[PDB]
Amino acid sequence: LSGAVTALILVIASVIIALVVVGFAFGLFGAFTGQGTVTQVGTATLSASTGTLKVTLKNTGATTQV
Amino acid sequence: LSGAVTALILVIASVIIALVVVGFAFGLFGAFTGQGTVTQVGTATLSASTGTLKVTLKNTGATTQV
């Protein structure tokens, strides 16, 4: 009964492996969308006195660092 | 009457052994299906302050441990 049980245990475990792959793919597809994008909308000015940059940055995503 | 009784006791005991094998195989087939599978559906976030992970895990099986 090696073929009666072994291919059965493979076809049970393969459902688990396939669902883990599909869940990881959907989690990655959720992750890279809302990961965070930043662009400029505001036409920044660079002061020559101290280097202070008054920039305007649009961010439709998550919290980032400069 | 060695052949009249001995092959008889073997053919009686072999039914017991075969039924134990078939019952164990069906119990194993019941066991590995509902043993417990866990996947991700929820696109977890990892906070960098304390390492707190807010995950969402789908579990169509039994109680497991991390």
Tab-separated table of N, CA and C in Angstrom, chain B residues 43-66:
chain	number	residue	atom	x	y	z
B	43	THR	N	-1.139	40.821	4.446
B	43	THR	CA	-0.103	41.806	4.104
B	43	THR	C	0.379	42.554	5.355
B	44	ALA	N	1.115	41.806	6.175
B	44	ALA	CA	1.535	42.253	7.496
B	44	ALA	C	2.448	43.474	7.433
B	45	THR	N	2.479	44.209	8.541
B	45	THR	CA	3.342	45.365	8.717
B	45	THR	C	4.292	45.107	9.874
B	46	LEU	N	5.555	45.463	9.687
B	46	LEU	CA	6.581	45.289	10.705
B	46	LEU	C	6.964	46.659	11.246
B	47	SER	N	6.515	46.966	12.459
B	47	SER	CA	6.882	48.227	13.086
B	47	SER	C	8.341	48.188	13.513
B	48	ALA	N	9.078	49.248	13.193
B	48	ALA	CA	10.498	49.297	13.508
B	48	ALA	C	10.779	49.769	14.926
B	49	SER	N	9.755	50.188	15.669
B	49	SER	CA	9.974	50.686	17.022
B	49	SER	C	10.292	49.547	17.982
B	50	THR	N	9.399	48.564	18.072
B	50	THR	CA	9.560	47.449	18.990
B	50	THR	C	9.619	46.099	18.296
B	51	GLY	N	9.467	46.051	16.977
B	51	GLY	CA	9.411	44.780	16.290
B	51	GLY	C	8.057	44.114	16.312
B	52	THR	N	7.007	44.842	16.678
B	52	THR	CA	5.668	44.274	16.752
B	52	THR	C	5.136	44.010	15.349
B	53	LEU	N	4.787	42.758	15.076
B	53	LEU	CA	4.319	42.333	13.767
B	53	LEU	C	2.814	42.118	13.817
B	54	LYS	N	2.074	42.887	13.025
B	54	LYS	CA	0.621	42.749	12.937
B	54	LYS	C	0.316	41.900	11.708
B	55	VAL	N	0.162	40.597	11.916
B	55	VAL	CA	0.019	39.654	10.818
B	55	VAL	C	-1.421	39.150	10.802
B	56	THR	N	-1.845	38.642	9.649
B	56	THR	CA	-3.140	37.988	9.513
B	56	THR	C	-2.914	36.617	8.903
B	57	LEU	N	-3.298	35.571	9.628
B	57	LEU	CA	-3.013	34.199	9.232
B	57	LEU	C	-4.302	33.403	9.132
B	58	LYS	N	-4.553	32.846	7.954
B	58	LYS	CA	-5.686	31.966	7.732
B	58	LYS	C	-5.313	30.552	8.144
B	59	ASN	N	-6.206	29.917	8.900
B	59	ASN	CA	-5.976	28.587	9.462
B	59	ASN	C	-7.261	27.786	9.286
B	60	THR	N	-7.276	26.895	8.296
B	60	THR	CA	-8.386	25.972	8.099
B	60	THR	C	-8.147	24.624	8.763
B	61	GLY	N	-7.323	24.576	9.803
B	61	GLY	CA	-7.005	23.314	10.436
B	61	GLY	C	-7.055	23.349	11.947
B	62	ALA	N	-6.056	22.757	12.592
B	62	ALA	CA	-6.043	22.619	14.037
B	62	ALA	C	-5.217	23.732	14.673
B	63	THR	N	-5.173	23.721	16.001
B	63	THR	CA	-4.437	24.722	16.755
B	63	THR	C	-2.944	24.440	16.679
B	64	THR	N	-2.173	25.432	16.249
B	64	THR	CA	-0.731	25.309	16.090
B	64	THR	C	-0.019	26.309	16.997
B	65	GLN	N	1.309	26.265	16.968
B	65	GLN	CA	2.143	27.163	17.750
B	65	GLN	C	3.204	27.777	16.852
B	66	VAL	N	3.584	29.013	17.160
B	66	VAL	CA	4.651	29.710	16.452
B	66	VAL	C	5.922	29.579	17.273
